[PDB]
Amino acid sequence: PNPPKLTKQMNAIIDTVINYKDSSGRQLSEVFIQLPSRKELPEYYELIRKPVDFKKIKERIRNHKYRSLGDLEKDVMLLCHNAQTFNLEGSQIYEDSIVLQSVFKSARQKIAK
Amino acid sequence: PVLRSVNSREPSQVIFCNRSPRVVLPVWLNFDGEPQPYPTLPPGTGRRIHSYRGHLWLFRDAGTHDGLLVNQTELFVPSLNVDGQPIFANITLPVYTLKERCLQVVRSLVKPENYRRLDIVRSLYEDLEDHPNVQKDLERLTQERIA
Amino acid sequence: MDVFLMIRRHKTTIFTDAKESSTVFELKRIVEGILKRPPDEQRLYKDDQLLDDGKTLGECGFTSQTARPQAPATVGLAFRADDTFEALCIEPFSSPPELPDVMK
Amino acid sequence: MYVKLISSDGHEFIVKREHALTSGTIKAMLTNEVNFREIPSHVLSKVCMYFTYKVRYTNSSTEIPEFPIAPEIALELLMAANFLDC
């Protein structure tokens, strides 16, 4: 298991990221919670080699899989990067992802450093 | 609030069957317990809705807000579909009280403004005017649940 | 399956149910249970049609529908005193007043 | 056991005791007789129909029929139902 203050930091950070909403009050993380199944949307799985959703990220904090915060960033940056890969530049989902990197990046150095 | 849907993100196929002579308005309670209207169901029609585990519904006469039953009860909540079996909702009439039923009928024959031209005791003018209403059955149901 | 009935004589009305496959003689045994008169003193009618004693209500024309709790069918009853039956007599009910104008 | 109910116009309505208790004020008022001085036959007949219905369809998982009320009697019946509390 992890030191309970690292596992305390981790949730705070990700809970920021998730709960974040735009000016419209629309929660930006919402699409990225859950993935489409392989039956639903098989192409996502054809194009994205390492799929990840926030669900899976939260579970890996409960289950202590990430040992540092550099470990956690990586898996988020992956989620965001996959999003950018499968979705067009200048698509709403792509925009959002780019926000959510620089929400995590900032909300790290605020709730960590 | 206590009467809300849960955001379970778990699909449940459900049959709404309208076995009432009334035109039914289905009403979903959102995750905050705010009620929401859905497209109505004509008498003796039944659609197969894609809802979710833990979501809440109740059924109401679309034109009058008279309340209706659903599988003998006031509220409907799906379990999970055992082996891709859909879950049924029989929307039926309740046994109204003779009094309420009479109110129903009068209300239907008389413009609100005229309730007070009817040769009846003054209380029955108020009784007529106290229309059925979802937010008020929700309140009643809320207090019952806790108890 | 159940049929719902108003057994009517003069100004007297009995609210009671019974099986569709139940006999008319069975119905008389009920009537006895209430008015205390024996079946041999009782004629029962669907309209003016006297009802053969050994028919089922089913056969007489009473059915799960047309004899419903909220709209029960009527069975005329006439009794016998001193070896003559009375003519089936059912005093009609009161009238509701002219519908209010506000209710048109 | 049955019970006799009597209209203002004097018509006599005999219903199973269990059905009559559907009214709160016919629990009270209860030889095994009741006069309704203000309720006529056409109304009281209908009330007895309500009793038959209520008992039959209460707790019924069957689909349930509408209780019919002609407009001409609806006011009178409201009053009666109000008075009987049922």
Curated annotation (Swiss-Prot), chain B:
Cite the annotated pathway: Protein modification; protein ubiquitination
Instruction: State the coiled-coil residue ranges.
Output: none
What happens after mutating S5L? In VHLD; type I
Tell me the outcome of changing L68F: In VHLD; type II
Q: What results from changing Y96D?
A: In VHLD; type I
Give the result of G54R, as annotated.
In VHLD; type I-II
Task: Tell me the outcome of changing F31L.
Answer: In cerebellar hemangioblastoma; uncertain significance
Impact of changing R22P on the protein?
A: In VHLD; type I
Q: What is the effect of changing V70L?
A: In ECYT2 and VHLD; type I
| Consequence of substituting V110F | In VHLD; type II
The name this protein carries in UniProt is von Hippel-Lindau disease tumor suppressor
Q: Tell me the outcome of changing V95M.
A: In VHLD; with RCC
Q: What is the effect of changing I120V?
A: In VHLD; type I
The free-text domain note is:
The Elongin BC complex binding domain is also known as BC-box with the consensus [APST]-L-x(3)-C-x(3)-[AILV].
Q: What is the effect of changing L41G?
A: In VHLD; type I; requires 2 nucleotide substitutions
Superkingdom per UniProt: Eukaryota
Q: What is the effect of changing N71T?
A: In VHLD; type I
Give the classification, highest ranks: Eukaryota, Metazoa, Chordata, Craniata, Vertebrata
Swiss-Prot record, chain C:
Write one Pfam family the protein is assigned to: ubiquitin
Q: Which GO MF term does the entry hold, naming one?
A: ubiquitin protein ligase binding
Every copy of the Ubiquitin-like domain together lies at 1-66
Where is this chain's protein located in or outside the cell?
A: Nucleus
Identify residues that carry N-acetylmethionine: M1
Q: Assembly state and interactors?
A: Heterotrimer of an A (ELOA, ELOA2 or ELOA3P), ELOB and ELOC subunit. The elongin BC complex interacts with EPOP; leading to recruit the elongin BC complex to Polycomb group (PcG) target genes, thereby restricting excessive activity of the PRC2/EED-EZH2 complex.
* Name of protein: Elongin-B
Per the UniProt entry, what species is this protein from, by scientific name?
Homo sapiens (Human)
Primary gene name: ELOB
UniProtKB/Swiss-Prot annotation, chain D:
Q: Name one Pfam family in it.
A: Skp1_POZ
> What is the reported tissue distribution?
Overexpressed in prostate cancer cell line PC-3 and breast cancer cell line SK-BR-3.
A GO molecular-function descriptor: transcription corepressor binding
What happens to this protein after translation, modification-wise? Ubiquitinated by the DCX(AMBRA1) complex, leading to its degradation by the proteasome.
Q: Which GO terms describe its cellular component?
A: Cul2-RING ubiquitin ligase complex; Cul5-RING ubiquitin ligase complex; cytosol; elongin complex; nucleoplasm
Query: Does the keyword section mention Ubl conjugation?
Result: yes
* Gene Ontology terms: biological process: protein ubiquitination; regulation of transcription by RNA polymerase II; target-directed miRNA degradation; transcription initiation at RNA polymerase II promoter; ubiquitin-dependent protein catabolic process
Q: Where in the cell is it found?
A: Nucleus
> Where is this chain primarily localised?
nucleus
Keywords, comma-separated and alphabetical: Host-virus interaction, Nucleus, Transcription, Transcription regulation, Ubl conjugation, Ubl conjugation pathway
Where does the UniProt annotation place the signal sequence?
none
In what pathway does it function?
Protein modification; protein ubiquitination
* InterPro entries in the cross-refs: ELC1 (IPR039948), SKP1-like (IPR001232), SKP1/BTB/POZ_sf (IPR011333), Skp1_comp_POZ (IPR016073)
Q: Does the keyword Transcription apply?
A: yes
Regarding protein family, the annotation reads: Belongs to the SKP1 family.
Mind telling me which PANTHER family this protein's record contains?
Answer: ELONGIN-C (PTHR20648)
Q: How does it assemble?
A: Heterotrimer of an A (ELOA, ELOA2 or ELOA3P), ELOB and ELOC subunit. The elongin BC complex interacts with EPOP; leading to recruit the elongin BC complex to Polycomb group (PcG) target genes, thereby restricting excessive activity of the PRC2/EED-EZH2 complex. (Microbial infection) Interacts with HIV-1 Vif; forming an active cullin-5-RING E3 ubiquitin-protein ligase complex (ECS complex).
What is this protein's name? Answer: Elongin-C
